[PDB]
């Protein structure tokens, strides 16, 4: 599969601190199932989302749904069946931080994974059990599709 | 082989050691006398090292009693020593072994329980052990004379009976003793979600009674508050219990906001569109205390994140919550007053603008519009939380305190805010700063004492003087209590009801001056 | 009264931490106490250091030749270093 | 599925549903509880039935029949805990509301009502209102 | 309190060592007291270094200029070898102590073996050695950096190489360099109690004069007159 | 003063401040044009930051190719709101005002005088101290 994470989120705030970038908005979203908090910078100009929307989110290691590594290089001419065909918005970034509530005595129960899609930042906070696929300086694909 | 060569030495170690004759000495002596050898030198070994420590204690203890020092000091010292030795050397396995050899502990337990310190010993032993049979039995039986929550909720029948008895005590507590009657029940309910849902459903059905079920609804909301304090989301509980099912949009919106313990423009926008529709859902549906506290901390702490296109939406929903009259024609909203809405929203808007601007002197500039607008109750609560968070900053009294004046408008003009204001100032009367010296701390304390005396003048007299008695018996120096009496007898007019004397005069026994104190004591004893 | 060549003396509490009385409290933490300092016009360092209830350690001058005459060559080395460091770093610039 | 429910609910200190329980459940498990609902300790059965509530409204609406059958099983367990949570939560998975005529021949609820009904009726005087009334204007407050 | 908490290595809480170190290293650390004495001596000499810094920097300014950026080198070590800070490390504390010791032996400013050359060597690299021992202490190396053995060896090699690259080359006309580096800011120096500054003051300092424009005595007080305005 | 004597200057400094903004997006032809001027380019077009609904690259994504080697740096944009380092959004920035170069990649922030100028600790300084004078020369020319 190569899907590090999957859920359905709903947007609970669009641009909370006031608009600071005319094409990018910092969505704050909640997950009903995993109860993960999500902060995610989205290029609203090409993929407009407004308040109260819902969307399936998927963080995947690859897109070819076979475990074949992506090579991290832009190949426009790809014949392999891409997972991105099932999604509307697709970004590609690198996880650059994994914080948690760990002490020196006990492991973390809550983890916060931070990803940078070319500058567009995302944080995903929640229980540690769902974020074991994330490891720092690994490449990930964020696949987001609006749900009716 | 025969264990004589080892077990006889095991027994002779406890024979020939210094001072063991007074004891398991019988058991080891039997193990030796049955094992043979030299039983005559055993008795000599027992009595050889008999240092007569006990008669030494006789001499010493009776000499301390000869000295005129209180023997109860000796009793406390011996009890503390032996109890500490027990706690340091208590073994839960051996307590369960005492249970194993017989279910009911012999009369030594029932003689210890007569002693208060040993009852507290069993409380500290058994409150932490929810599976040790001796300890669980002792705590449960002493409750029959804390009921351990594990055995409180182990079955319906025990939980129900302790629940109804404790709730009867809460209702008997009126409005003061609940502080002691509610936690024993609440922590019992707040252990599992099934005992939770059961107790909440029972209190919901009980709340439908118009002959006081409002109080059961209050206690249910308090238990839900405590369940939140234990980190358990009872959002969907209140949803499926109340009329949230009548409106799925309000249900999902509100329940999400409650589950997070925070607001959001999304659910807020849902409720705004619902109450902007021609059919606004019930105002009771949003009138939930923690929810309105979310409104407070959104609109009156520095920050939070806020948009102007939603600032007015938060304000208008809170105005609808605080303003609209829905009359039930057999649970039918047929008359909707929304005429006291716009003024309330305007006042909330202006006051929230001031509060989130992080105001002092500018307060005094627009204090006219403030005391005009504190007449709105919800606005009074909002300013109360704002001034609480500003003044609760460490060392906010070294830099302007005008904020304490505003309670005068609040408490005087709103009776039911007397409990909050005093329950604010109880924190502020315990203010302590190393920068602002004890002189300035006492200055602020005496200022707060004048505020509390004014609040007493509005009728909030029983808990004021009760807490004044408690902190004098504790913290509050005699100077502060004397100044309290000075200001009181300088402002209060006779007659003085005995409900006030019963706490004010027996704490005034410490002093006799502020002479008005002599007049007060003479009048109130005669 | 007073020592000659001292035409004015300004007394003040420095709000900048550099001249504040920095100590190490018993916990081992740096604490910058606010204490009165006097800055004068005209210098007589031997006399003012000889005064009573004057800190004879931290008291210094901005006149380097005074320092050389009263304290010595290593003292005026250090004082000259601090003085030209001050005049350079006053405008915010930095040099090694 | 039963040992799965153990490994997600083995801890007895938590008598509540674990937070994010729908995620610590799965729709496959939402159906498959019925296979081994009666196999665990009754505490775990309770925690599962209570976990039914935190699941999203729509996800329960899709698998409403499964939770209906699970509550029907919950109404059979010897521990009265399971009986009354089944009694309360009969209607939720398909209706979205809970039972409220809850004096349902349980002698324990009968004791609670038979005492506290008349106790509350006696304590109507100075009955401390809910905490909502503080924030409301006088007209709605009186109404 | 904070210094001891953050720098004194703990070899008495097993849980921390399991979280930070592989179980074989935890057993090695807990078993024998020799390594424990070595770490105790490490912390003791770090305390001595702290007192030395306290007497050198009485103003408490921690900003100081030094050759090798130890934090950036540690970060480069982390990201070259893909150090996972979420997992226990495989680096002995004793290996950290011995590595920093032999590295400090390798960093030479003055060479020789008589007491004079050795004392000058100690004084020349005193501050950098203090900074190195504080930064690469086994406590922080095992808690926050979590470097592996090969990463630590690479780090020591890089510190050695960069330090040797940082020594002043003989033949460098440092006099002219100092003259130009102190003359250039005079072109930017302007002129706004009232005290003379700028190029007049710099002139007088280099052009040493018997007549200051604004001579002064920043005279301090020690008794209660330091705080009492009346006595002042 | 143990710092770079030359940094990035007027037009290119203003333009790289505008370029590394979070919301700079470049389509395929634009990045293919820009990579012509990158002398140190290895010839591999990086994966776009956004693939669907259209391929787009970020300004930081292109600038990460300009940054040489695997240097690592932390600075703050000129308009960095102090008290941001204390809030919940410490390592995620609403204003994108903390520049974090990581393994030779600019993963977040807006570059300015305080990170590309002549200040000690600037990105060009670390480039000099790590990669040597030649690679830093190429870095300067490529930025220009």
UniProtKB/TrEMBL annotation, chain A:
Tell me where on the tree of life, at the top rank, the source sits.
Answer: Eukaryota
What subcellular compartments does it reside in? Nucleus
MF terms from GO for this chain are: DNA-directed RNA polymerase activity
What SMART domains does the record point to? Answer: RPOL8c
Q: Name one GO biological process term.
A: DNA-templated transcription
PANTHER family the record matches: DNA-DIRECTED RNA POLYMERASES I, II, AND III SUBUNIT RPABC3
Q: What is this protein called?
A: DNA-directed RNA polymerases I, II, and III subunit RPABC3
**Which species is the source of this protein?**
Sus scrofa
Q: Which gene encodes it?
A: POLR2H
From TrEMBL, chain E:
Q: Which domain of life is it from?
A: Eukaryota
Where does this one sit in the cell?
Answer: Chromosome; Cytoplasm; Nucleus
Family indicated by similarity? Belongs to the RNA polymerase beta' chain family.
Q: What does this protein do?
A: DNA-dependent RNA polymerase catalyzes the transcription of DNA into RNA using the four ribonucleoside triphosphates as substrates. RNA-dependent RNA polymerase that catalyzes the extension of a non-coding RNA (ncRNA) at the 3'-end using the four ribonucleoside triphosphates as substrates. An internal ncRNA sequence near the 3'-end serves as a template in a single-round Pol II-mediated RNA polymerization reaction. May decrease the stability of ncRNAs that repress Pol II-mediated gene transcription.
Full protein name:
DNA-directed RNA polymerase subunit
- Where does this protein come from, organism-wise? Sus scrofa
Q: Lineage from the top down? A: Eukaryota, Metazoa, Chordata, Craniata, Vertebrata
- Name of encoding gene: POLR2A
What fragment of the whole protein does this chain represent? 914 to 1154 of 1970
């Amino acid at each position: 599969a190569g899907i590090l994470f999957e859920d359905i989120f709903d947007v609970k705030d669009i641009d909370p601190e006031g608009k600071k970038f005319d094409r990018v908005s910092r969505l704050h979203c909640e997950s009903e199932s995993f109860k993960m908090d999500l902060i995610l910078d989205v290029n609203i100009q090409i993929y407009p989302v407004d308040l109260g929307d819902k969307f399936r989110l998927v963080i995947a290691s690859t897109l070819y749904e076979d475990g074949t590594l992506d090579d991290g290089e832009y190949n426009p001419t790809d014949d392999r069946p891409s997972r991105a065909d099932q999604f509307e918005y697709v970004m590609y970034g690198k996880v650059y931080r994994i914080e948690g509530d760990e002490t020196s005595t006990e492991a973390a129960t809550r983890l916060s994974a931070y990803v940078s899609y070319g500058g567009l930042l995302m944080r995903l906070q929640g229980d540690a059990n769902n974020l074991h696929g994330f490891e720092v300086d690994s490449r990930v694909y964020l696949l987001m599709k609006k749900l009716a | 082989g025969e264990d004589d060569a080892e077990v006889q030495q095991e027994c002779l170690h406890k024979f020939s050691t210094r001072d063991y004759i007074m004891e398991s000495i019988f058991n080891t002596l039997k193990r030796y006398f049955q094992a043979g050898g030299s039983p005559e030198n055993v008795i000599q070994l027992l009595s050889e090292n008999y240092t007569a420590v006990a008669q030494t204690v006789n001499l010493l203890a009776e000499w301390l009693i000869q000295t005129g020092v209180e023997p109860v000091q000796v009793q406390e010292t011996v009890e503390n020593h032996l109890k500490s030795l027990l706690i340091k050397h208590f073994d839960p396995r051996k307590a369960d072994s005492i249970f194993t050899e017989e279910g009911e502990t012999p009369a030594w337990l029932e003689q210890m329980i007569a002693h208060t310190t040993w009852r507290d010993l069993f409380y500290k032993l058994a409150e932490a052990h929810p599976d040790c049979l001796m300890l669980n039995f002792t705590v449960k039986l002493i409750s029959d004379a804390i009921t351990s929550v594990s055995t409180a909720c182990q079955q319906l029948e025990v939980f129900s009976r302790v629940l109804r008895t404790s709730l009867a005590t809460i209702l008997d507590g009126g409005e003061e003793n609940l502080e002691k009657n509610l936690p024993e029940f609440a922590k019992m309910v707040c252990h599992g979600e099934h005992t939770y849902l059961f107790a909440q459903a029972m209190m919901s059905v009980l709340a439908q009674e118009e002959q006081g079920g409002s109080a059961v609804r209050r206690i249910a909301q308090e238990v839900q508050r405590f369940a939140q304090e234990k980190g358990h989301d009872a959002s969907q509980i209140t949803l499926a219990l109340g009329t949230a099912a009548s409106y799925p949009r309000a249900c999902q919106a509100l329940g999400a906001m409650l589950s997070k313990g925070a607001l959001n423009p999304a659910d807020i926008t849902v409720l705004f569109k619902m109450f902007t529709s021609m059919d606004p859902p019930p105002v009771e549906l949003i009138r939930v205390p923690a929810f309105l506290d979310l409104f407070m901390q959104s609109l009156f702490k520095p920050g939070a994140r806020i948009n102007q296109d939603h600032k007015h939406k938060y304000i208008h929903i809170l105005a609808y919550a605080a303003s609209v009259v829905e009359t039930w024609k057999k649970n039918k909203r047929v008359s909707i007053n929304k005429d006291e809405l716009k003024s309330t929203s305007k006042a909330v808007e202006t006051v929230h603008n001031l509060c989130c601007n992080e105001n002092a002197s500018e307060l005094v500039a627009e204090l006219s519009t403030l005391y005009q607008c504190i007449r709105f109750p919800v606005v009074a609560m909002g300013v109360l939380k704002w001034v609480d968070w500003t003044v609760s900053e460490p060392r906010y009294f070294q830099l302007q305190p005008v904020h304490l004046a505003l309670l005068d408008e609040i408490s005087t003009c709103h009776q039911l805010l007397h409990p909050q204001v005093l329950q604010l100032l109880v924190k502020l009367f315990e203010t302590e700063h190393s920068q602002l010296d004890v002189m300035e701390q006492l200055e602020l304390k005496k200022t707060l004492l004048d505020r509390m005396v004014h609040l007493l003048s509005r009728g909030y007299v029983l808990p004021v003087v009760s807490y004044i008695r408690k902190c004098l018996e504790k913290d509050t120096d005699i100077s502060l209590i004397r100044y309290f009496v000075t200001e009181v007898l300088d402002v209060i007019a006779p007659p003085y009801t005995s409900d006030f004397v019963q706490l004010f005069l027996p704490i005034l026994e410490n002093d006799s001056i502020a002479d008005p104190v002599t007049e007060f004591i003479a009048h109130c004893k005669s | 009264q007073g020592i000659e060549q001292i035409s004015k003396v300004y007394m003040h509490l420095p709000q900048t931490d550099n001249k504040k009385k920095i100590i190490i409290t018993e916990d081992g933490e740096f604490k910058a106490l606010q204490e009165w300092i006097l800055e004068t016009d005209g210098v007589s360092l031997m006399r003012v250091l000889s005064e009573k209830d004057v800190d004879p350690v931290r008291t210094t001058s901005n006149d380097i030749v005074e320092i050389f005459t009263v304290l010595g060559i290593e003292a005026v080395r250090k004082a000259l270093e601090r003085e030209l460091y001050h005049v350079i770093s006053f405008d915010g610039s930095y040099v090694n | 599925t039963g040992l799965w429910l153990h490994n997600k609910l083995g801890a007895t200190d938590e008598l509540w549903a674990p937070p994010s329980i729908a995620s610590l459940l799965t729709a496959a498990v939402i159906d498959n509880i019925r296979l081994c609902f009666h196999g665990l300790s009754s505490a775990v059965k309770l925690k599962l039935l209570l976990g039914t509530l935190h699941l999203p409204r729509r996800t329960v609406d899709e698998m409403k029949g499964a939770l209906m059958e699970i509550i029907q099983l919950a109404s059979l367990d010897s521990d009265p805990w399971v009986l009354m949570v089944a009694d309360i939560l009969k209607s939720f998975p398909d209706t979205g509301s809970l039972n409220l005529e809850l004096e349902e021949q349980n002698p324990n609820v009968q004791d609670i009502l038979g005492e506290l009904r008349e106790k509350v009726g006696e304590c109507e005087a100075s009955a401390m209102l809910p905490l909502e009334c503080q924030y409301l204007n006088k007209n709605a407050l009186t109404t | 309190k904070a210094f001891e908490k953050k720098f004194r290595f703990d070899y008495t809480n097993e849980r921390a060592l399991r979280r930070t170190l592989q179980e074989d290293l935890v057993k090695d650390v807990l078993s024998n007291a020799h390594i424990q004495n070595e770490l105790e001596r490490e912390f003791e000499r770090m305390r001595e270094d702290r007192e030395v810094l306290r007497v050198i920097f009485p103003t408490g300014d921690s900003k100081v200029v030094l050759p090798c950026n130890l934090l950036r080198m540690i970060w480069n070590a982390q990201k070259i070898f893909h150090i996972n800070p979420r997992l226990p490390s495989d680096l002995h504390p004793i290996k950290v102590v011995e590595g920093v010791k032999e590295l400090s032996k390798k960093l030479v400013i003055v060479n020789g073996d008589d007491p004079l050359s050795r004392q000058a060597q100690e004084n020349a690299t005193l501050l950098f050695n203090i900074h190195l021992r504080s930064t690469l202490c086994s406590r922080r190396m095992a808690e926050e950096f979590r470097l592996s053995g090969e990463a630590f060896d690479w780090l020591l090699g890089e510190i050695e190489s960069k330090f040797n690259q940082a020594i002043a080359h003989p033949g460098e006309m440092v006099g002219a360099l100092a003259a130009q580096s102190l003359g250039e800011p005079a072109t930017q120096m302007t002129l706004n109690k009232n005290v003379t500054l700028g190029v007049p003051r710099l002139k007088e300092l280099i052009n040493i004069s018997k007549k200051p424009k604004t001579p002064s005595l920043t005279v301090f007080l020690l008794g209660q007159s330091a705080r009492d305005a009346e006595r002042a | 003063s143990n710092r770079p004597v030359m940094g990035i200057v007027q037009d290119t400094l203003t333009a790289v401040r505008k370029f590394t903004k979070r919301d700079v997006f470049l389509e395929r032809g634009e990045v293919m044009n820009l990579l012509m001027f990158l002398s140190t380019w290895d010839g591999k077009v990086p994966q776009p930051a956004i693939l669907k609904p259209r391929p787009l690259w970020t300004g930081k994504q292109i600038f990460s190719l300009i940054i040489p080697g695997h240097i690592n740096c932390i600075r703050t944009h000129s308009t960095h709101p102090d008290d941001e380092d204390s809030g919940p959004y410490k390592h995620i920035s609403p204003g994108d005002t903390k520049v974090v170069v990581e393994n030779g990649e600019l993963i977040m922030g807006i570059l300015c005088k305080k990170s590309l100028g002549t200040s000690a600790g600037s990105l060009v300084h670390i480039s000099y101290l790590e990669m040597g004078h030649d690679i830093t020369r190429l870095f300067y020319s490529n930025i220009q």
